[PDB]
Design a protein around this ligand. Structure first.
Ligand SMILES: Cc1cc2nc3c(=O)[nH]c(=O)nc-3n(C[C@H](O)[C@H](O)[C@H](O)CO)c2cc1N(C)C
Ligand SMILES: Cc1cc2nc3c(=O)[nH]c(=O)nc-3n(C[C@H](O)[C@H](O)[C@H](O)CO)c2cc1N(C)C
Ligand SMILES: Cc1cc2nc3c(=O)[nH]c(=O)nc-3n(C[C@H](O)[C@H](O)[C@H](O)CO)c2cc1N(C)C
Ligand SMILES: Cc1cc2nc3c(=O)[nH]c(=O)nc-3n(C[C@H](O)[C@H](O)[C@H](O)CO)c2cc1N(C)C
Lengths: 200, 197, 199
């Protein structure tokens, strides 16, 4: 589990073809001596499992994950090539506060940035989502976009706004985001369960 | 508490009947020196208390009435492989979701489909547990933290990644097999808020 | 941080009014040599900072803590007089086992015991939760009551049930608890999260 507070911008260094999947080697600022095999790392919102790390005597910092059909088809990972910059977050540890918005890394789908506008040193992103996700995108609600926890600023039908502050633009991949880009979206877990209850 | 990330495949070595319960000796890769009496270990999702310990690597647990009735443990015999997870220690990563090891019942695998080196399992849960199973929500099946990828009534599908197929008992699971299901406790919190309102 | 496994039953030795607070001296079975000034100890669920220990040469076993406006208002501490027995738990370190659940020692309020019923192996305590906390107390969830890690066995409107096993009655202050008694309540992490999103 995660909070949607991005702590590193990883870079996809190597892409290798697997049997209906891909092997991703992701360069990171994280110390590999703090990562265990089988650990969960959120990669632009997608929870992925570490399968390989550098040898103990290596100076290089990276981790390897394997993305399979579900992650490939639903998330932006299908378009990830060598050089791609991604948001990274380590898993919450027992003892850590849960905060105001839990992110689990099971991405619901994708939203498209349809407009990008500067507002001082901040940037307003207008996005469109699939109809199915619209009931979950609510005013003042929290949502994870590319693994980044963000407040829904304005909403118009299937379109909604998020306001990204200068700091968030610097430490995440959001600074390079352009109109037309796809981002991973994860709705709130509590709202998800509340809605599933309501249909009964 | 647990997180649904399996760290060992244990083997049931001894099964001894008791008064309204069973005694189980599980062979494990866990170091007995790291285990104390009274410790909680999730055995294929079922939270059981260690009652007996030994260089030999094993622990003993007792499954009572509720556990034997609700879970797959009633079918556990010598030779059976089970998923194992240690209780979270302070500072341990909660890589899945919050898993408590109170199994709500049994789910039956209705379909196993190969997806390259990953495997899609379609399962059928009890009707009572269906409202707690949401699309792209979490579930613990045989103690494994998994995303519900699609849901249709009481039927749902999960995808088992290569790594998990290697380090868990899921690699040998087939259609017809029953698994332990713990619904997300967070879904129970949602139900409580809806009940109050 | 704490887990809700009580390791000593302390006795409130003295209570002294302070400027906007109260000083408490608590008699303990803990070795004062293993306690440092500034250490966190859960006192019937309430996380408190050690402000004083016995002097050099002294063989006495006590520690002093100070309770401020929030602790005095929200918790049972305002009622603590000399002789009062309280649950004690030491703060855990990185890598320590967590046999209860995650307990921060930030008490949310007071729950009142309404019923105590002996059921052989365990004693069933029925409690009334504060109105604000009740919607976030759910079956199978964990609760810290007087710092004791307990499972919510069932919920009935503003009331809920907990089961206390014989060992817990022996090692905690729950052995002397009766109907009408107010206990400290801290809801677990999922409950706290649900309470945060609703408010
Ligand atoms: C609930 C919540 C909402 C947030 N909303 C926003 C937001 O609307 N805009 C923004 O630039 N940054 C945000 N943030 C902060 C960003 O998530 C972080 O700055 C980035 O992940 C980089 O660490 C929010 C954080 C939150 N936490 C408490 C879970
Ligand atoms: C703990 C955890 C680990 C996961 N590891 C992987 C993984 O290693 N490869 C993969 O393709 N998909 C994974 N997934 C599933 C992907 O995150 C989802 O398929 C995408 O987010 C799309 O929903 C994992 C999920 C997990 N839980 C927490 C949600
Ligand atoms: C900490 C803990 C220890 C438990 N130990 C045992 C146990 O030792 N034997 C047993 O039959 N059932 C147990 N249980 C209850 C079993 O996990 C449940 O009966 C089964 O999962 C079926 O719901 C324990 C439960 C616990 N928490 C989660 C409340
Ligand atoms: C590390 C820590 C130390 C604390 N020390 C004290 C303290 O020394 N006195 C006090 O009145 N309240 C305290 N508090 C706050 C009290 O525990 C809360 O006011 C009560 O539990 C009521 O919420 C401390 C809290 C702490 N963390 C866990 C949050």
């Amino acid at each position: 589990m995660f909070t949607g507070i991005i702590t590193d911008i990883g870079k996809v260094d190597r892409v290798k073809p697997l049997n209906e999947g891909v092997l991703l080697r992701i360069e990171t600022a994280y110390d590999p001596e703090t990562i265990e095999l089988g650990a969960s790392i959120a990669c632009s919102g997608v929870c992925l499992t570490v399968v390989a790390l550098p040898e103990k005597g290596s100076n290089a910092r990276w981790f390897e994950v394997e993305a399979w059909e579900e992650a490939l088809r639903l998330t932006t990972i299908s378009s990830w090539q060598s050089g791609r910059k991604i948001n990274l977050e380590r898993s919450l540890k027992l003892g850590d506060e849960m905060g105001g918005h839990l992110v689990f890394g099971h991405v619901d789908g994708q939203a498209e940035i349809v407009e990008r506008k500067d507002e001082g040193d901040a940037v307003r992103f207008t996005l469109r989502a699939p109809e199915e996700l619209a009931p979950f995108i609510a005013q003042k609600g929290s949502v994870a976009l590319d693994g980044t926890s963000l407040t829904v600023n304005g909403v118009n039908a299937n379109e909604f706004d998020v306001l990204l502050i200068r700091h968030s633009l610097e430490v995440t991949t959001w600074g390079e985001r352009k109109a037309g880009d796809k981002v991973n979206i994860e709705i709130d877990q509590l709202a998800r369960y509340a809605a599933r209850l309501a249909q009964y």
